[PDB]
Amino acid sequence: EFSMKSVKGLLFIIASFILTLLTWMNTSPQFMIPGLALTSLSLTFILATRLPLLESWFHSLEKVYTVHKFTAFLSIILLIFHNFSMGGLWGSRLAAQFGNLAIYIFASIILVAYLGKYIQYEAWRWIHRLVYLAYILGLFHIYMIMGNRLLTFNLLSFLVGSYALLGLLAGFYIIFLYQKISFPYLGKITHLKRLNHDTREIQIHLSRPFNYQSGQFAFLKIFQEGFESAPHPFSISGGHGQTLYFTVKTSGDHTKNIYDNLQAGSKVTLDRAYGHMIIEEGRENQVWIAGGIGITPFISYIREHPILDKQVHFYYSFRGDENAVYLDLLRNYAQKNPNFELHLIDSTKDGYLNFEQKEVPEHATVYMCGPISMMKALAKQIKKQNPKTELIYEGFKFK
Template sequence: MHIKTWHAVLFLALMSCALVIVELPQTTWLTSAALSLSFGAAAVALMGAAALLGGRWKSVESLFGGLDRVYLTHKWLGIWALVFASFHFVFKANLEAWQTASIISLPPYYTRLARQLSFIALMLIVMLALNRKIPYSVWRWWHKLSGPLFLIVILHWLSFKSPIALDSPAGIWLATLSALGVAAAGYKLLLYPFLANHAEYRIVEANSGANALHLELAPVKRALSFEPGQFGFIRMKEDGLREPHPFTIASHSEPDGHVHFVIRALGDYTHKLVKEASAGMYADIYAPYGRFRRLPASEREVWIGGGVGISPFIAWLTDQSAKNLEKVTLFYFFTPGREFPSAEVLDDLARQYGAEFIPVSTGPSSPEFIRRFGEIAQNAGPAAVDISFCGPKGLLKRIQALMRENKIPDANLRYEYFEFR
């Protein structure tokens, strides 16, 4: 059982509001001022938790079941923090019946300035995080400001007069989350490049085609240990390509330590990487991340890869320790002329390891796909079919609808979120 996004948002919000409310006179609990103060505390708590999740700490990843889930929760914590902060900004969080004092005393001008800047800082963080039109190179550097901007939010909490004392349960709660958030943001900003698990690799082969790239890299000194289906962040040591990007590892752990990636040209950076990557270049790989693992105990397995989402299934398929691949049907969704690797290469690979391979070039409405999917569910029994998916959101929704049509339980679907932004 892992923490889900709604678990985190709901728990942090309710806990923050409850701890604040009990500090107030009961006669004021239902006032807009009480709600404003509670929602302001919730916004601080959610921001602290979002900063904590952004640190890429392994312990946090384990709690959420994968870094893809961590980043999804990180995004929604920021969104809900802005919702609560907006209410707090509009309504006055003070009443004459309250005994108030500031934790840190600032001149009135700077207290008001911290209040205004904290809301602007939060709004800026969330808007930048959600704006997909910003080039990644620009977005990444702006997003690095999230930690320093969070300090302004903390300053606002400490400097404005409220009935929340630092040594009260609410004060300890906010101080703890703020401290963890600042520590994680500081680690990610300053220490992560040095302390996170990583190794230097050299490209030994770079084959490109159909706006995609297959990279094979060899370790320079030591090799990273990973499981098939996990992913890593590649940071090329070349001018113009130094931005770290996440890519699924398309191989199992090999004796020589080599690692493979299949990369699709989807944005400015990946287009440049596909065009310029060549043998002899060096890169740092930060890995492993992700919890997208095969469940070999399943009676019947269906693997569905969309576009570059085929990468983890290549790793699963070629895993030397893999068993019972004859129970596997691999569906590969691709756009004709853009598939990489080609359907022919994957078909040969599947035959070699005993799995069934079905290429689908006409989308999820393909009669062949719908027919074969239904046959698998009917022959094995809906409850016995385990589905693993990696691909775009639109394709995922269609797969979920097809599962319902064939009475396959929702719990039988495992998937990795395809996009981080």
Template structure:
């Protein structure tokens, strides 16, 4: 079982490492001198924003490298990317306020002086900072407000590495506290170099350094609800995984663009890997056109979404649509070792035609006396909710709850369960916020 303290430590590590530069900065002068007046206070706050923002920016670049160690200090790589999204937004705010707060002292002279401070000039160390902020702003605007094809969207994020390099030069050439404080300078230099190495490792030289396992397509089965189960076999050694985990798959096929996407395994451990993939979006709309013999590369496995990662053997599983995929991996993996588990599985789809795996699940139920399955159709029964589940599973508050489905479904059920009194540590969702 995972060490829960270690698995949640990543958030605290980011906070501590981000605040460390400001702590070194505070050691230089007394606080009274830093905040003796409005001009001194805004300048100090601007410096704190810049130092904290730069350290956090470094950590966000490092997090994007998708290293295995992040699985241990977060509750799976999914949680690492949730942290990446949260702290990434905070980083941008800090770096945005950094020049605005510093401009206050120039505003006391004149608005023109403040404007000149914020605009490009002949002083290139300052220009590097402006360029870094401009690239970051444009990239984030594209991310949040413009819908692009995945491969284009992913390419734009390489510019964040470029923005970081400009920011790095800005920090070390601008002639600020970083230049006079050796401890601060050394800390930010090491953190920055690790970030640059992480960026080069993942974004530039990933094809050379990242281990990917070669597989080949053995078959593609069309299932209800526009779901295809893609079957792969290894060209060499097979990959081992925990039921419920996912991998990044890059197919080499004329039907698909060559980019890695995350997919949960629907198979148990074994020579053959299976993925339940729904036909939707630019990429997966052509998934059914894969052919036997098409090559694939697998990176992983990742994730901590598995019934075996929780000590509580009384569980409720809730799947929405293609969110059944990781649960199929778990169901197909049930064996004698899992006889102590008591599982209520809610399989929710729009209508009867949407049950992609119903027949197989019914066969699995016959072999597992402690497994109970509730097939739920929203067309005739309405959306699944915590009250319905409480009625059918009276001891739900004493169970661990695993949910995989649409973002709206997972968010709503989580809110309802929390309101119902279930401890948040008992609720586990599979969220692909990985890009």
């Protein structure tokens, strides 16, 4: 759910709508519903830019994309009502036909957005990018319909133009510029290690020092013959300065390609560090819960803090001993650090993680990284036991 950590972002949405409505209600009341939709559309594009301000305002990128989907639905509902109240299925003049085409493209794209199971991610993104064409068609419709009412020196013109320009710039940046100018960390793959039958560790030497905090992730672009160059999110699993570690589990065609065919010496690009699961900023007492590859952020901390400064109970749940990674590293860390408690749960034979019996520290922060299904029950049990325990969770998807 949403909390005060996102309130600023929420305020930015709410102030966006009221200021829009009060504007239209003052100039063209008959156009509150379309105009609001326009503002909403703009916000949708602004919510896709992955800018650090967005993460600061909405806490996490997952909440950013949740609000992005909400603005999309609000836009489409308002646009459908506007079409019903002010037209039919095809316009009589070019200005109305632009709106017809724009609304058809918007509806089709929103319908296809919930077709990700049947569509590869890159094809999904390429289909999704038609929102820019729909937005341009809608802007053309709006401006040829309104004429000089939106080209004068008044509040309505400034508001409409400002939101339209912000949406246009956000869409252009995310579609055409983000992968070309916003990936300034150029690196070379120097070492690869296969941890088990389906997980590979990648070591990257960068041209510049990379600043991150343990528990954060980054978008990686790989440049190799036979590899896709689309950015994929991976948690940083160690390294400092000009060295980075990423631990990739096989979960699809691209990650299987990484496990099988990735070569040392290939080019990689990284943009920046994302994430709200900063372990070093938590309480003194901490409980770590990792499911499978969700161990990747905590490992980073272990690799960057040889002497543990917190009281940590780590629960690592894996589906069989063949699916476990970094067991020797975790055992060495537990032996070296008396304040580190290690609980290895083989879910095939030991059952599952149950917190109805295990104790929790009083003033404790609980970090969760793993499947949402098994994290939800654990969070419910922990909240039932100690309702004031701080809880942070990070998932491995956006849609």
